[PDB]
Amino acid sequence: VVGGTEAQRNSWPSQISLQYRSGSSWAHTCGGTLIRQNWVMTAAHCVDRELTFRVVVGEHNLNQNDGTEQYVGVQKIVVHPYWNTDDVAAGYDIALLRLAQSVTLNSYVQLGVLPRAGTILANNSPCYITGWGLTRTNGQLAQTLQQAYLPTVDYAICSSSSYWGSTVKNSMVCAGGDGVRSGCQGDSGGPLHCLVNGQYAVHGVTSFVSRLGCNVTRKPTVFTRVSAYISWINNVIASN
Ligand SMILES: [Xe]
């Protein structure tokens, strides 16, 4: 997250760190949202590589003991069947991870609330991106979970020529684009949390930014629109 602030420890308890085994250690690679005690929602592109993955829930600082973490292996990966790794712009950037164990819920570990199917946010709706991704274009991962306030940019504006044009689909949510704050590498797969009727819900799964950089004016961060995938999500969980 570029232009973020440090999240309070208990603000976003559905945020997870998706990590891969790297020698004798583990490396953060993406975010995710805990949606059942044994299922995480993330981006398909996060799991294209043939790596060994684990999830950390109750994580705040990637590099220090928080006293709240639970570490769990990924048992099964279900990518959206229409995902194509060479065409992120086509959409379908979503995947579900079945965890080897069911995690325990508490003030640091909670299920993310998902929007009702079909819900589209009005232009300029209040949302926060969260993650441990790069804090500058071509920078380094954050140590502590970051948040940034990124208002939505509706499909009409986002798909206009000076924004993303044809690259953005109605199965996506755009947010931000102010040139100061944005998602960045390592935020992929994580939540976009939007306040609706007094409650935050996870409306987006972080998918991409501009090849030119993270915080680029009129290139808002682009997310998979969760409310487009509610039936798919339910179908996977019910058959697995
Ligand atoms: Xe990203």
Side-chain angles (χ1 to χ4, degrees):
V1 181
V2 183
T5 56
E6 186 184 348
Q8 308 305 328
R9 208 169 274 281
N10 54 7
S11 282
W12 314 109
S14 66
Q15 169 86 57
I16 72 76
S17 173
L18 179 63
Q19 311 191 337
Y20 66 92
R21 184 93 108 68
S22 184
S24 55
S25 69
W26 292 90
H28 173 93
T29 194
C30 280
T33 300
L34 192 66
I35 61 164
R36 301 287 191 286
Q37 287 182 72
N38 67 330
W39 286 97
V40 165
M41 178 177 66
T42 188
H45 84 251
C46 289
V47 291
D48 284 326
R49 294 175 292 174
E50 229 59 68
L51 307 172
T52 296
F53 296 100
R54 72 179 187 180
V55 158
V56 194
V57 304
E59 181 72 290
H60 183 69
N61 190 312
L62 290 173
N63 311 124
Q64 292 178 202
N65 180 29
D66 289 301
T68 57
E69 301 96 325
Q70 305 167 48
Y71 304 88
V72 189
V74 170
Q75 184 177 77
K76 192 179 179 52
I77 300 173
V78 186
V79 176
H80 195 288
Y82 268 179
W83 170 245
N84 173 7
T85 192
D86 293 319
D87 195 353
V88 69
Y92 306 110
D93 194 10
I94 189 167
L96 296 180
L97 315 182
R98 190 173 71 210
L99 307 182
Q101 287 88 41
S102 289
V103 306
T104 300
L105 307 186
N106 56 46
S107 66
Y108 312 97
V109 183
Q110 290 288 309
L111 312 180
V113 185
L114 303 193
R116 295 166 173 282
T119 302
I120 305 294
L121 296 165
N123 190 53
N124 210 43
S125 289
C127 304
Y128 283 93
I129 191 178
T130 55
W132 293 271
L134 309 192
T135 61
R136 294 195 66 179
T137 297
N138 295 312
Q140 64 184 323
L141 298 175
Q143 291 200 296
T144 60
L145 184 65
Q146 302 287 295
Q147 65 189 51
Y149 181 70
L150 294 193
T152 65
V153 179
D154 74 19
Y155 173 78
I157 295 161
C158 193
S159 67
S160 77
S161 54
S162 65
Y163 286 75
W164 283 100
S166 66
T167 295
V168 154
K169 310 300 183 289
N170 229 313
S171 63
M172 300 166 188
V173 176
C174 303
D178 74 353
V180 178
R181 41 217 172 157
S182 68
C184 203
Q185 285 75 20
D187 289 323
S188 289
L192 180 71
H193 317 266
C194 303
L195 188 60
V196 184
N197 292 313
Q199 174 198 65
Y200 279 101
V202 178
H203 283 247
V205 175
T206 306
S207 183
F208 65 92
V209 294
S210 179
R211 279 194 287 101
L212 285 185
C214 292
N215 55 307
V216 171
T217 306
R218 297 199 181 204
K219 295 286 179 296
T221 308
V222 184
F223 307 78
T224 307
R225 180 164 57 84
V226 172
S227 73
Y229 293 92
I230 298 305
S231 290
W232 180 76
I233 293 163
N234 287 342
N235 288 342
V236 169
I237 290 172
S239 67
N240 287 291

